[PDB]
Amino acid sequence: STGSATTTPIDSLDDAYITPVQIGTPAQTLNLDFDTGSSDLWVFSSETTASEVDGQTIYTPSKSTTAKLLSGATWSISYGDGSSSSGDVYTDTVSVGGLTVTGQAVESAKKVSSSFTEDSTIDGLLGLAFSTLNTVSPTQQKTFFDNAKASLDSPVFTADLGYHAPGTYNFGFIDTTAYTGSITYTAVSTKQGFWEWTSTGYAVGSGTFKSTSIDGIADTGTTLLYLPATVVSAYWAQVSGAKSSSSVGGYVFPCSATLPSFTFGVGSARIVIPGDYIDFGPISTGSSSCFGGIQSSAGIGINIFGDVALKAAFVVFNGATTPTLGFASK
């Protein structure tokens, strides 16, 4: 089997992407944030504290003839950005882009933190990291991909995120029309439960490539590119007036600037992030200070190849017995 679904930016900055997901019988379609940095499929629901729901579409398990309470199971997750959610668990039929999994754990939120409530466009998350990170207790649950894997034509999914435009998540096949040149595959460590890999270096604009190993994670659920402070300083030093602002929470730059590209290495291959992808616009409406899309990972504890990086590439998440990651230009 295969599946193919379009993913759409939630706003004009590409802060996140939503993908329609069918849950239950008859189908209830919710728009979920596909997150290769976590492993829980959770949704706003009829059980979510009413004051914490503001415009989201909810899953109502009592209206699904295939929903079953997973008795005694609870979940609770905290994300890197400080957001969180928790609740109980149903199993139900879940379909993405025509690919159907029966008996998928659907984690129903009883509580969500303010960041989730405030984002009316995101109805929940669909985790695509390794199932070892799943938070359901006392019986850990599998991700949608893990459950689908054996049925898929090939045990892979691909992320093809758009820059200020829709893109595609495919399951079970590689669309050879969706990228240019060849796909370069690179080793993955699953030791921390992430799609963790080692970039071979970087360049700023038309500058020379610096060969250096940068361990990090491919994370579709993180907006920006978070890299070591040395790398980030070298980038922003090429933008007149750019500076790190503790009050704003990162590097800012004059909105009048033209940003240089940023290149990262994948083996001997190179992925080029155009400068425009690094512009996250005014820090507040009407400001002439703009927020940068490359930020320091210092104090995160891990480097994160988030959407800024991933949307410059066609990315293969290869879930074969020995997983790997592939990157192609597009």
* CB-side neighbour CA atoms (13 Å) of 273: 25
Q: What is the 3-state secondary structure (H, E, C) of 38-82?
A: CCCEEECECCCCHHHCCCCCCECHHHCCCCEEEEEEEEEEECCCC
Please say whether the beta carbons of 176 and 189 come within 8 A: no
Quick check: 193 and 129 in contact, CB under 8 A? yes
- Would you call 174 helix, strand, or coil by DSSP? coil
Q: Where are the domains of the chain?
A: 5-174, 175-330
Resolution (Å units): 1.2
Sign of CA dihedral 243, 248, 249, 255: negative
199 given a catalytic annotation: yes
Q: Where are the alpha helices (DSSP H) in the chain?
A: 114-118, 144-148, 229-236, 307-310
Q: Which two tokens stand for residue 60?
A: 């109502």
Catalytic residue among 14, 33, 35, 92: 35
Q: Are 64 and 24 in contact (CB under 8 A)?
A: yes
Bridge partners for 186 per DSSP: 325
CATH tag, 175-330: 2.40.70.10
Task: From the candidates 85, 86, 108, 199, give the one annotated as an active-site residue.
Answer: 199
Count CB-CB contacts under 10 A for residue 275: 17
Beta-carbon count within 10 A of 50 CB: 7
Q: Is 13 left (phi over 0), alpha (psi -120 to 50) or beta?
A: alpha
Report, at the CATH architecture level, how domain 5-174 is classified.
Beta Barrel (2.40)
Strand pairing class (225-227; 156-160) = unpaired
DSSP character for 121? T
Matching residue, tokens 């600037």: 257
d(CA 153, CA 284): 47
Exp. method: X-ray
Residue 118 near residue 54 (C-beta atoms within 8 A): yes
What does the alpha-carbon distance between residue 252 and residue 6 come to, in Å, rounded to a whole number?
Answer: 32
Task: Provide the CB-side half-sphere exposure for 5 (13 A, CA).
Answer: 23
SS3 279: strand
DSSP of 1-17: --EEEEEEESSTT---E
The Cβ of residue 120 has, within 10 Å, a number of other Cβ atoms equal to 13
Q: Is 35 a catalytic residue?
A: yes
Q: Which residues contact 314 (CB under 8 A, 6 or more apart)?
A: 158, 159, 160, 178, 179, 183, 327, 328, 329, 330
Please name the amino acid found at residue 40: D
Q: Is 40:30 a contact under the CB 8 Å cutoff? A: no
Pair of tokens at residue 303: 């480097």
User: Which residues face 187 on adjacent strands?
Assistant: 324
Q: What does the alpha-carbon distance between residue 75 and residue 136 come to, in Å, rounded to a whole number?
A: 4
Tokens of 175: 């669309």
CATH topology agreement for domains 5-174 and 175-330? yes
